[PDB]
């Protein structure tokens, strides 16, 4: 009866539970906020490039993470763990989003073939340029300046989104925004802007890690205060009229 | 059939012959992104010669449709996979399979 | 016009930083014109221009000032790390000051001292916080150990501010006293937005700033003197999720009875937005209702077949994914799956009917409202409709629709099973 009811109890499989451990990843962005409020719009077209060095599993699993396609923060937030879509606390997690990682867009674990010849991952020394499209969303990117067609419509841009980049461990990459720090191998195409116009004063722009709650503290557990963003009021700069 | 798709192909022409251990280091997958198998977590590259009918012929046909050092996204089907029977306890009936196949060597 | 701001073409170059106003700039763009402006208005004072400023208590007009309650992150330590006996002492420094309160909570969005599950007090106001307002001690600022401590045995909750024992109006040590130990008290640190703290439980006596003064000789232990481990801390969270069967709402209850039927509804004025998420995905043309009383819009409802991911419970309604295939041209293709009901509805007409096969028609009361989407790769759903009302019997909740949630076939009557909640 034990072996009979063992082999009777196993093949049900609605009883059989599932678990899947996942790597801990981290999103990042530059200090630039979008803040593109219609009425006094500064720019609607930006451009930046992401140069890379290494994306291999050095002592790790090959299931890495490195994405740039902008996600809906009206649906996503920067937390280090959560979500029924197999986690992956980075870019392109929410269903109302996409994410470009060389060959495809994964809108909430729904594979969407992005149209480009020589589809290959974000491998060593492969730039990833960014481009903005809002009014009719066809958000261009390019990998080494080749036509990444089939861009994403109905990404919820009701208002705005945020600039993003995701990366797992075992990663070594560089922004390309402007000045010395953006050595634009593929320049902004016609109707775009090397994304350093908003190098606002009082500070040199830099990364932010997507408003982290607590870095690897060492002195004592710093209860870093609640900050929503640059402004507790809203997400907008001030054109005075 | 095995609608092979390349990821990072190498030489592109070192196809496998008969009696050649495809040293495959795959990561088996299902639809929805639900994992069912993996060789990377094991650190045990899968090995199989051609024609002897160890694995489902998805692996055999895809390997035959594959070169050395070729990372590829294989796509098997229920006819070649376990099908309406299903490997019990893991696989349900009528399943389409995915494999992050990466052939390394042939001995 | 687009003076160097024509986004597409840029017929002429030499865009400047001046396009963003003098808020972005400083007076450096303004030394040339503001001096002549000041000369002009100086001689306008030479006319006799009489003009006092508006935002001043003399010309009392400033009525745009009020607080902001949001993301009051209630830092805590672990329930497993709770304490019931012996003397305990944890320091709490301060980087800033503001709506920030510390002390010892209890396991129990409502802040410290709102209810009978915590003890705390503020540096912004210097007042105890346990189920009300009560003055105590003194304010503090940046660089101030609060020096929180308890004696769990005879209930002497003290706060040694940099060694400065803080006292009430009567001039007594004990802030909180004669409190039931119950289920223990945990260190806690409330912070509203733009208020920062940094706590040292007991991880290092050297890192403990002022402990030898008032913690060591008094028998008062660090909170993690013995922990050979990184002690844990966590916060009241921002997104709303599903864990709990409440059964303690302002007035909402849950039952079941046979067409199925339940019992529900509040009488408090439910201006705010509520929540719901069924527990059991039940399964044994497919007409099954999800009724709610406030129908024919006491408040306008917003029915939408909708998935898990939200981030808000607010009146921002009607603010909710489309494949577009390229062929190395940019012109889209294969756009059939897209956006992966109306605001009319219910219980004066009666119902919100589910229907199933793939094939869904989720409309209120069997009137064709032109259901657009039949998109379903996979969606484990439970009926989570949230909206307002004038609070008349505020909510309700009723093969059939119990057929696309599990492996058996569609069958009408759902049978007796022990979990249905």
XYZ file of C-alpha atoms in Angstrom:
769
model
C 0.000 0.000 0.000
C 2.893 2.417 0.558
C 4.290 1.980 -2.948
C 0.805 1.872 -4.495
C -0.307 5.083 -2.776
C 3.130 6.642 -3.382
C 2.743 6.130 -7.129
C -0.915 7.201 -6.771
C -0.058 10.377 -4.851
C 2.827 11.481 -7.073
C 1.171 11.756 -10.537
C -1.528 14.233 -9.444
C 0.905 17.148 -9.750
C -1.585 19.893 -8.918
C -0.508 19.001 -5.378
C 3.158 19.073 -6.364
C 4.608 22.430 -5.377
C 7.180 24.496 -7.262
C 10.119 26.654 -6.193
C 12.688 28.580 -8.229
C 15.608 30.413 -6.658
C 16.576 33.563 -8.575
C 19.647 35.777 -8.699
C 19.687 39.124 -6.897
C 20.092 41.920 -9.472
C 20.142 45.711 -9.271
C 18.690 48.494 -11.391
C 20.440 51.792 -12.020
C 19.853 55.139 -13.687
C 21.758 58.395 -14.141
C 20.902 61.424 -12.029
C 18.794 62.799 -14.909
C 15.051 62.620 -14.325
C 12.733 62.704 -17.319
C 10.328 65.329 -15.946
C 9.001 66.033 -19.457
C 5.732 67.812 -18.648
C 3.745 68.808 -21.727
C 3.165 72.560 -22.051
C 6.748 73.730 -21.519
C 8.568 70.721 -22.958
C 12.345 71.073 -23.107
C 13.065 67.926 -25.162
C 11.059 64.944 -26.364
C 14.059 63.120 -27.937
C 17.080 61.895 -25.973
C 20.021 59.686 -26.830
C 22.535 57.765 -24.779
C 24.675 54.696 -25.252
C 25.776 51.907 -22.926
C 29.211 50.421 -23.591
C 30.084 47.045 -22.088
C 33.091 44.825 -21.293
C 31.942 41.534 -19.694
C 28.636 39.662 -19.266
C 29.796 36.032 -18.675
C 29.047 33.599 -15.765
C 32.437 33.761 -14.055
C 31.612 31.372 -11.169
C 27.831 31.733 -11.551
C 24.806 30.503 -13.449
C 24.507 31.626 -17.065
C 21.059 33.135 -16.284
C 22.370 36.704 -15.988
C 20.507 40.018 -16.337
C 21.331 43.158 -18.310
C 18.523 45.273 -19.801
C 17.802 48.877 -20.783
C 14.252 49.027 -22.193
C 12.324 51.505 -20.087
C 9.740 50.121 -17.648
C 6.526 51.634 -16.308
C 7.120 52.841 -12.757
C 3.320 53.195 -12.741
C 3.480 49.435 -12.250
C 7.130 49.033 -11.146
C 9.060 50.330 -8.137
C 12.692 49.946 -6.987
C 12.442 47.206 -4.324
C 15.047 44.441 -3.808
C 12.538 41.557 -3.798
C 8.977 40.704 -4.851
C 6.611 40.072 -7.752
C 4.797 36.967 -9.039
C 6.677 37.110 -12.405
C 9.723 35.135 -11.158
C 11.318 38.188 -9.522
C 14.407 39.604 -11.191
C 14.426 42.974 -9.422
C 15.518 45.011 -12.435
C 14.295 46.373 -15.737
C 11.357 45.002 -17.695
C 9.828 43.234 -14.697
C 6.279 44.595 -14.826
C 3.888 43.437 -17.529
C 3.365 47.062 -18.654
C 6.975 47.225 -19.846
C 9.591 45.689 -22.137
C 13.331 45.214 -21.970
C 16.075 45.138 -24.588
C 18.811 42.549 -24.006
C 20.095 41.969 -27.533
C 17.473 39.772 -29.239
C 14.022 40.143 -27.669
C 11.656 42.145 -25.492
C 10.174 40.365 -22.454
C 6.962 42.166 -21.481
C 6.209 40.357 -18.240
C 7.769 37.046 -19.359
C 5.979 37.309 -22.739
C 8.646 36.962 -25.421
C 8.418 39.638 -28.129
C 10.834 39.298 -31.033
C 12.482 42.641 -31.726
C 13.380 42.962 -35.409
C 17.134 43.317 -35.985
C 19.692 41.390 -38.114
C 22.366 39.428 -36.245
C 20.399 39.079 -33.036
C 22.942 38.560 -30.262
C 23.044 39.293 -26.549
C 24.638 42.327 -24.886
C 28.003 40.651 -25.350
C 31.519 42.031 -24.894
C 32.029 45.393 -26.625
C 28.516 45.766 -28.049
C 27.088 49.236 -27.507
C 23.376 49.764 -26.825
C 22.023 53.141 -27.898
C 18.777 54.573 -26.536
C 16.113 56.681 -28.224
C 12.842 58.186 -27.015
C 9.389 57.959 -28.609
C 6.286 59.000 -26.651
C 3.360 60.348 -28.689
C 3.117 57.201 -30.840
C 5.278 54.737 -28.829
C 7.837 53.146 -31.114
C 10.779 53.425 -28.749
C 13.895 52.951 -30.827
C 17.162 51.537 -29.589
C 20.128 50.260 -31.561
C 22.840 47.707 -30.844
C 26.001 48.854 -32.652
C 23.898 51.057 -34.946
C 21.780 48.462 -36.765
C 18.026 48.732 -37.370
C 16.239 47.483 -34.251
C 12.767 47.614 -35.772
C 9.536 46.190 -34.367
C 9.627 48.638 -31.475
C 7.096 48.550 -28.668
C 3.607 50.077 -28.846
C 1.225 50.412 -25.897
C 3.981 50.639 -23.329
C 2.057 52.707 -20.804
C 3.638 56.178 -21.070
C 0.505 57.865 -19.689
C 2.567 60.776 -18.410
C 6.204 59.681 -18.226
C 8.580 56.908 -17.149
C 12.203 56.876 -15.878
C 15.656 56.337 -17.416
C 16.899 52.883 -16.426
C 19.577 50.255 -16.754
C 19.628 46.822 -15.111
C 22.613 44.628 -14.408
C 23.265 41.373 -12.586
C 26.531 40.467 -10.912
C 29.522 39.678 -13.091
C 28.919 42.865 -15.110
C 31.273 45.631 -16.274
C 29.683 48.460 -18.308
C 29.838 52.221 -18.891
C 27.326 54.948 -19.612
C 27.850 57.232 -22.599
C 26.006 60.518 -21.962
C 28.352 63.326 -22.981
C 31.496 65.293 -22.403
C 34.489 63.062 -21.830
C 32.137 60.440 -20.402
C 30.128 60.047 -23.615
C 32.466 59.132 -26.461
C 29.599 58.691 -28.885
C 30.666 56.022 -31.356
C 27.163 56.274 -32.846
C 26.013 59.861 -32.478
C 22.422 60.993 -31.890
C 20.599 60.441 -35.221
C 18.458 63.236 -36.733
C 15.956 64.480 -34.183
C 17.723 63.214 -31.060
C 19.950 64.593 -28.315
C 23.025 63.182 -26.610
C 21.463 62.836 -23.188
C 23.488 65.383 -21.244
C 21.509 68.574 -21.926
C 20.143 68.372 -18.367
C 23.513 68.405 -16.628
C 21.889 70.554 -13.987
C 24.086 72.816 -11.831
C 25.068 72.398 -8.134
C 26.395 68.840 -8.836
C 28.010 66.720 -11.535
C 25.504 64.100 -12.686
C 26.187 60.463 -11.856
C 24.416 57.185 -11.075
C 21.714 56.766 -8.408
C 21.039 52.974 -8.174
C 17.278 53.744 -8.441
C 16.741 55.330 -4.981
C 18.217 52.580 -2.830
C 16.941 52.124 0.728
C 20.261 51.076 2.257
C 23.632 50.302 0.697
C 26.112 47.885 2.303
C 26.442 49.812 5.545
C 29.398 48.989 7.799
C 29.417 51.513 10.659
C 25.894 50.946 11.968
C 22.552 50.197 10.353
C 21.702 53.596 8.905
C 17.921 53.909 8.766
C 18.111 56.057 5.642
C 15.012 58.177 5.584
C 12.039 57.879 3.216
C 12.795 59.789 0.018
C 10.473 59.365 -2.954
C 12.643 61.290 -5.448
C 14.329 64.701 -5.946
C 10.960 66.323 -5.054
C 8.404 65.110 -2.524
C 5.844 67.323 -4.302
C 5.874 65.745 -7.774
C 8.115 64.595 -10.660
C 8.529 67.843 -12.619
C 10.996 70.805 -13.088
C 9.861 74.460 -12.914
C 9.416 76.579 -16.057
C 8.293 79.838 -14.450
C 5.628 81.782 -16.387
C 9.794 20.401 -35.600
C 13.021 21.619 -34.006
C 12.748 25.293 -34.961
C 16.342 26.043 -34.024
C 17.361 29.608 -33.166
C 20.957 30.711 -32.662
C 22.185 32.869 -29.767
C 25.993 33.049 -30.066
C 27.111 30.662 -32.825
C 30.777 29.774 -33.198
C 32.290 28.226 -36.317
C 28.773 27.422 -37.529
C 29.707 24.236 -39.461
C 31.081 21.606 -37.004
C 27.924 19.510 -37.166
C 27.718 16.230 -35.202
C 28.360 12.861 -36.815
C 27.188 9.380 -35.859
C 28.576 8.126 -32.572
C 29.641 11.577 -31.355
C 28.980 12.598 -27.747
C 27.313 15.974 -28.063
C 28.715 17.493 -24.881
C 25.581 19.544 -24.289
C 25.405 21.950 -21.339
C 21.790 22.945 -21.866
C 19.223 24.513 -19.562
C 15.874 22.909 -20.213
C 12.782 25.083 -20.161
C 9.046 24.992 -20.760
C 6.617 27.632 -21.936
C 5.779 30.545 -19.566
C 9.409 30.616 -18.358
C 8.768 27.688 -15.995
C 12.001 25.753 -15.643
C 11.906 21.950 -15.641
C 15.558 20.967 -16.206
C 19.086 22.303 -16.022
C 22.661 21.140 -16.573
C 24.375 24.392 -15.532
C 23.144 24.023 -11.945
C 24.543 20.482 -12.001
C 27.872 21.417 -13.629
C 27.392 18.125 -15.514
C 27.386 18.674 -19.301
C 24.848 16.363 -20.898
C 26.347 13.764 -23.252
C 24.661 11.750 -25.993
C 25.701 10.113 -29.243
C 23.453 10.392 -32.309
C 20.927 7.769 -33.376
C 20.850 5.551 -30.273
C 17.513 7.060 -29.044
C 18.488 8.034 -25.497
C 17.021 11.542 -25.606
C 13.899 12.632 -27.455
C 14.775 13.394 -31.080
C 14.349 17.112 -30.383
C 17.898 17.058 -29.025
C 19.082 14.750 -31.809
C 17.578 16.802 -34.638
C 18.585 20.128 -33.103
C 22.134 18.914 -32.464
C 22.211 17.716 -36.077
C 20.941 21.219 -36.969
C 23.722 22.721 -34.805
C 27.465 23.349 -34.901
C 30.139 23.287 -32.208
C 30.131 26.010 -29.576
C 26.659 27.034 -30.765
C 24.479 28.508 -28.071
C 20.951 28.049 -29.386
C 17.332 28.221 -28.272
C 15.830 24.901 -29.320
C 12.056 24.461 -29.571
C 10.789 20.888 -29.360
C 7.116 19.899 -29.713
C 4.737 17.298 -28.181
C 5.198 14.864 -31.101
C 8.941 14.524 -30.411
C 8.732 15.271 -26.660
C 6.783 13.205 -24.104
C 3.562 14.383 -25.760
C 0.089 13.589 -24.452
C 1.695 11.002 -22.128
C 4.120 13.322 -20.340
C 7.010 12.447 -18.049
C 4.837 11.955 -14.945
C 5.122 14.113 -11.852
C 6.994 16.869 -13.744
C 5.689 17.178 -17.303
C 1.906 17.427 -17.966
C 0.261 16.251 -21.200
C 0.622 18.174 -24.463
C 3.710 20.290 -23.752
C 6.022 22.367 -25.967
C 9.607 22.415 -24.689
C 12.485 24.897 -24.897
C 16.207 24.251 -24.377
C 19.098 26.704 -24.030
C 21.305 24.239 -25.850
C 25.049 24.870 -26.038
C 27.081 22.118 -27.692
C 30.746 22.209 -26.657
C 32.729 19.158 -27.847
C 32.400 15.886 -29.756
C 34.437 12.823 -28.732
C 8.586 79.147 -31.851
C 11.457 76.722 -31.199
C 14.526 78.970 -30.998
C 17.079 76.116 -31.261
C 14.355 73.914 -29.643
C 12.811 72.411 -32.784
C 13.292 68.872 -31.567
C 13.475 67.102 -34.951
C 15.469 69.299 -37.359
C 17.512 72.110 -35.684
C 17.710 74.438 -38.699
C 19.992 76.691 -36.587
C 22.380 75.720 -33.783
C 23.622 77.533 -30.612
C 21.088 76.404 -28.066
C 21.902 78.008 -24.684
C 21.351 77.162 -20.987
C 19.016 80.193 -20.841
C 16.123 78.173 -22.354
C 15.471 76.815 -18.875
C 14.496 79.989 -16.911
C 16.508 82.010 -14.380
C 15.511 79.371 -11.796
C 18.016 77.036 -13.491
C 20.379 79.934 -14.086
C 21.545 82.279 -11.338
C 22.081 86.028 -11.247
C 25.114 85.602 -13.596
C 22.750 85.901 -16.595
C 21.069 88.842 -14.762
C 23.801 91.287 -13.655
C 23.322 93.228 -16.911
C 19.542 93.842 -16.692
C 18.737 93.604 -12.974
C 20.881 96.647 -12.134
C 18.932 98.791 -14.610
C 15.715 97.268 -13.250
C 16.806 98.211 -9.739
C 17.626 101.748 -10.888
C 14.154 101.958 -12.458
C 12.293 100.740 -9.380
C 14.576 102.873 -7.169
C 13.281 105.964 -8.922
C 9.794 104.393 -8.724
C 10.321 104.596 -4.975
C 11.297 108.153 -5.920
C 7.745 108.415 -7.238
C 6.389 107.078 -3.932
C 5.533 103.486 -4.830
C 3.949 101.990 -1.688
C 3.883 98.186 -1.924
C 4.314 95.815 1.024
C 4.966 92.154 0.304
C 2.068 89.628 0.388
C 3.653 86.654 2.192
C 4.085 88.408 5.532
C 2.203 88.283 8.834
C 1.438 92.024 8.671
C -0.421 91.648 5.353
C -1.792 88.330 6.593
C -2.365 86.261 3.432
C -0.199 83.102 3.784
C -2.700 80.200 3.786
C -0.823 77.600 1.674
C 0.959 75.733 4.515
C 0.105 72.187 5.620
C 1.782 68.872 6.357
C 2.411 65.802 4.206
C 1.723 62.317 5.589
C 3.085 59.646 3.259
C 5.643 56.825 3.394
C 5.961 56.951 7.187
C 8.482 54.133 7.170
C 8.163 52.402 10.542
C 11.578 50.802 10.912
C 11.523 47.828 13.283
C 13.578 44.821 14.318
C 12.457 41.198 14.153
C 9.580 39.644 16.060
C 11.963 36.776 16.787
C 14.356 39.373 18.260
C 11.626 40.740 20.577
C 12.284 41.088 24.324
C 10.159 40.213 27.377
C 12.523 40.414 30.374
C 15.629 42.134 31.654
C 16.987 45.598 31.007
C 17.506 46.652 27.384
C 19.082 49.697 25.771
C 19.514 50.758 22.153
C 20.859 54.061 20.932
C 19.194 55.968 18.119
C 21.206 58.802 16.605
C 19.634 61.406 14.325
C 20.907 62.844 11.058
C 17.910 65.224 10.807
C 14.810 66.243 12.764
C 11.151 66.296 11.849
C 8.235 63.863 11.931
C 10.422 61.106 13.392
C 9.548 59.105 16.503
C 11.424 56.307 18.257
C 10.925 54.137 21.307
C 9.767 50.520 21.523
C 6.844 49.250 19.454
C 4.703 46.173 20.030
C 3.737 43.437 17.566
C 0.190 44.463 16.690
C 0.331 53.329 8.316
C -0.916 54.184 11.813
C 2.116 55.643 13.513
C 3.597 55.393 16.999
C 1.124 56.101 19.767
C -1.873 56.028 17.434
C -3.051 52.817 19.178
C -2.223 50.506 22.105
C 0.674 48.690 20.395
C 3.725 50.938 20.880
C 5.512 53.456 23.079
C 7.361 56.391 21.548
C 7.960 60.136 21.605
C 9.245 62.842 19.283
C 12.114 65.288 19.052
C 10.030 67.543 16.817
C 7.668 68.268 19.747
C 9.094 66.619 22.919
C 5.984 64.634 23.833
C 5.184 61.028 24.667
C 3.134 59.010 22.179
C 0.950 56.225 23.551
C -2.702 56.463 22.485
C -2.605 60.270 22.629
C -0.524 63.382 23.268
C 1.558 63.983 26.397
C 4.541 66.308 26.852
C 7.901 64.832 27.854
C 11.587 65.581 27.897
C 13.012 67.891 25.272
C 13.442 68.296 21.536
C 16.585 67.143 19.728
C 18.337 67.717 16.410
C 21.102 66.191 14.297
C 23.735 64.305 16.261
C 21.618 63.166 19.211
C 21.504 59.711 20.707
C 17.929 59.248 21.835
C 19.265 56.395 23.951
C 16.153 54.274 24.086
C 15.879 51.683 26.825
C 13.468 49.585 28.866
C 13.406 47.506 32.016
C 10.938 44.777 31.133
C 10.495 43.525 34.713
C 9.114 46.546 36.645
C 8.380 48.657 33.524
C 10.822 51.603 33.542
C 10.944 52.879 29.960
C 13.602 55.618 29.943
C 15.347 57.621 27.218
C 18.939 58.687 27.952
C 19.639 61.513 25.500
C 23.454 61.579 25.230
C 23.463 60.779 28.940
C 20.839 63.485 29.554
C 18.046 61.642 31.338
C 14.845 63.141 29.904
C 11.966 63.958 32.259
C 8.269 64.745 32.026
C 6.554 67.906 33.277
C 6.540 66.434 36.794
C 10.306 65.831 36.562
C 10.276 62.023 36.706
C 12.467 59.456 34.961
C 9.861 57.091 33.601
C 8.189 58.090 30.344
C 6.066 54.936 30.046
C 5.231 52.738 32.980
C 2.972 49.955 34.246
C 2.635 48.443 30.763
C 1.704 44.812 30.209
C 4.621 42.837 28.814
C 2.157 40.757 26.799
C 3.821 39.830 23.497
C 6.991 41.864 23.968
C 8.255 45.191 22.671
C 10.643 45.636 19.737
C 12.860 48.652 18.931
C 11.084 50.897 16.465
C 11.912 54.052 14.537
C 9.215 56.027 12.748
C 10.402 58.311 9.963
C 8.183 60.454 7.807
C 9.571 61.654 4.502
C 12.771 63.748 4.635
C 13.576 62.408 8.138
C 16.681 60.247 8.556
C 17.918 58.076 11.411
C 20.689 55.636 12.226
C 20.358 52.991 14.922
C 22.892 50.847 16.787
C 21.094 47.933 18.439
C 24.049 46.412 20.275
C 26.444 45.544 17.471
C 29.455 47.255 19.069
C 29.873 48.964 22.429
C 32.492 51.190 20.786
C 29.906 52.198 18.177
C 27.499 52.818 21.062
C 28.239 56.489 21.666
C 26.906 57.140 25.206
C 26.389 53.742 26.863
C 28.994 53.712 29.633
C 27.333 56.808 31.125
C 23.803 55.445 31.491
C 23.637 51.916 30.015
C 26.580 50.022 31.488
C 26.449 50.681 35.239
C 22.621 50.639 35.258
C 22.532 46.959 34.232
C 21.100 47.990 30.854
C 22.056 45.589 28.116
C 22.616 46.311 24.413
C 19.902 44.930 22.177
C 22.375 42.722 20.219
C 25.308 42.249 22.605
C 25.106 38.451 22.212
C 24.040 38.349 18.542
C 26.979 37.012 16.516
C 24.993 37.947 13.418
C 23.682 40.862 11.383
C 20.456 41.749 13.179
C 17.478 42.323 10.894
C 15.261 45.370 10.456
C 12.271 46.107 8.251
C 9.544 48.596 7.462
C 5.861 49.186 6.870
C 5.554 48.706 3.136
C 4.309 50.862 0.274
C 2.647 48.607 -2.280
C -0.520 46.905 -0.966
C -0.526 43.093 -1.220
C -2.690 40.168 0.007
C -1.837 38.190 3.163
C -4.651 38.508 5.692
C -8.319 37.706 6.170
C -9.173 40.961 8.040
C -12.613 40.358 9.652
C -12.018 43.607 11.658
C -12.926 46.300 9.122
C -14.863 49.416 10.115
C -17.775 47.188 9.274
C -17.237 44.363 6.756
C -17.976 40.649 7.298
C -17.610 37.438 5.272
C -19.984 34.460 5.042
C -21.387 32.136 2.358
C -24.778 30.622 1.546
C -26.723 29.479 -1.509
C -27.232 30.896 -6.875
C -24.553 31.632 -4.279
C -24.758 34.460 -1.757
C -22.753 36.129 1.028
C -23.133 38.979 3.546
C -21.197 42.235 3.492
C -21.419 46.008 3.846
C -20.343 48.956 6.013
C -22.062 52.104 7.288
C -19.022 54.338 7.839
C -18.669 56.928 5.088
C -16.498 54.998 2.620
C -15.148 57.921 0.645
C -11.778 56.158 0.465
C -10.874 53.199 -1.755
C -11.273 49.638 -0.473
C -9.746 46.293 -1.412
C -10.802 42.729 -2.059
C -9.091 39.526 -3.146
C -10.813 36.135 -2.942
C -8.857 33.285 -1.354
C -10.048 30.066 -2.988
C -10.091 29.741 -6.820
C -13.290 27.720 -6.867
C -14.089 25.147 -9.524
C -16.413 22.158 -9.812
C -23.612 31.324 -20.888
C -21.577 30.842 -17.692
C -23.628 33.398 -15.807
C -22.263 34.080 -12.318
C -22.548 37.518 -10.732
C -20.235 39.545 -8.530
C -22.792 41.908 -7.004
C -22.072 45.006 -4.914
C -24.793 47.295 -3.551
C -23.714 50.854 -4.558
C -25.245 50.689 -8.028
C -26.577 53.223 -10.498
C -23.541 55.221 -9.266
C -23.956 56.392 -5.703
C -20.343 56.826 -6.675
C -19.238 55.979 -10.195
C -17.605 52.554 -10.261
C -14.751 51.500 -12.564
C -15.110 47.846 -13.537
C -12.009 46.494 -15.225
C -10.869 42.944 -15.763
C -7.423 43.639 -14.367
C -4.346 41.754 -13.201
C -2.307 41.954 -9.987
C 0.107 44.824 -10.582
C -1.042 48.108 -9.083
C 0.839 50.609 -6.980
C -1.953 52.963 -5.801
C -5.188 53.159 -3.849
C -6.340 56.593 -4.945
C -8.866 58.325 -7.195
C -6.438 58.214 -10.162
C -8.865 56.134 -12.217
C -8.728 55.495 -15.973
C -4.908 55.299 -15.998
C -4.079 51.658 -16.753
C 1.249 46.078 -23.955
C 1.085 45.559 -27.730
C 3.291 43.430 -29.954
C 4.504 45.233 -33.082
C 6.522 43.156 -35.533
C 9.232 44.711 -37.665
C 10.616 43.244 -40.892
C 13.705 45.466 -41.145
C 11.426 48.337 -42.249
C 9.991 49.785 -39.004
C 6.402 49.412 -40.198
C 4.590 47.352 -37.558
C 2.863 44.003 -38.119
C 1.089 41.263 -36.105
C -0.669 43.833 -33.851
C -3.586 41.669 -32.683
C -2.713 41.172 -28.989
C -3.033 44.620 -27.433
C -3.403 46.223 -23.985
C -2.448 43.006 -22.218
C -15.511 47.280 -18.598
C -17.235 50.676 -18.481
C -17.991 52.939 -15.504
C -21.745 52.259 -15.564
C -22.997 49.136 -13.789
C -24.676 47.500 -10.897
C -27.232 46.928 -8.010
C -30.058 48.955 -9.114
C -29.895 46.833 -12.295
C -28.324 43.990 -10.186
C -25.061 42.268 -11.081
C -21.563 41.953 -12.561
C -21.679 38.688 -14.519
C -18.649 36.591 -15.317
C -18.630 34.432 -18.438
C -16.095 31.958 -19.825
C -15.511 29.491 -22.683
C -10.418 32.519 -24.360
C -13.986 33.859 -24.410
C -14.964 36.338 -21.664
C -17.868 38.805 -21.406
C -17.596 40.673 -18.079
C -20.425 43.225 -18.165
C -22.914 44.474 -15.591
C -26.470 43.092 -15.862
C -26.334 41.451 -19.289
C -26.313 44.637 -21.405
C -23.769 44.720 -24.223
C -21.114 47.315 -23.319
C -18.809 46.247 -26.203
C -16.262 44.129 -24.356
C -13.062 44.620 -26.334
C -10.365 42.316 -24.965
C -10.379 38.527 -24.934
C -6.648 38.452 -24.200
C -5.718 35.532 -21.951
C -2.277 33.927 -22.166
C -2.623 33.125 -18.456
C -4.273 35.062 -15.593
C -4.849 33.640 -12.135
C -7.493 36.200 -11.127
C -9.526 36.861 -8.032
C -12.235 39.514 -8.190
C -10.619 42.735 -6.956
C -12.987 45.584 -7.814
C -12.261 48.734 -5.806
C -14.275 51.947 -5.987
C -16.128 54.423 -3.778
C -19.774 54.933 -2.827
C -22.055 57.031 -0.645
C -21.764 54.036 1.745
C -25.168 52.271 1.232
C -24.384 48.624 2.214
C -21.043 49.328 0.775
C -20.026 46.021 -0.827
C -21.163 42.493 -1.599
C -19.918 39.340 -3.297
C -21.937 36.470 -4.758
C -21.018 25.029 -15.798
C -20.522 28.528 -14.370
C -17.634 30.977 -13.892
C -16.219 28.391 -11.429
C -14.819 26.482 -14.438
C -11.582 28.259 -15.617
C -9.687 28.130 -12.320
C -8.664 24.447 -11.951
C -8.441 21.071 -13.720
C -12.048 19.632 -13.626
C -14.631 20.273 -16.336
C -17.168 23.142 -16.234
C -19.940 22.084 -13.858
C -22.636 24.238 -12.292
C -23.124 23.232 -8.616
C -19.968 23.683 -6.477
C -19.897 20.974 -3.810
C -19.230 21.126 -0.069
C -15.535 21.480 0.783
C -14.001 22.620 4.026
C -12.170 25.827 2.884
C -14.348 28.530 1.338
C -13.329 32.018 2.485
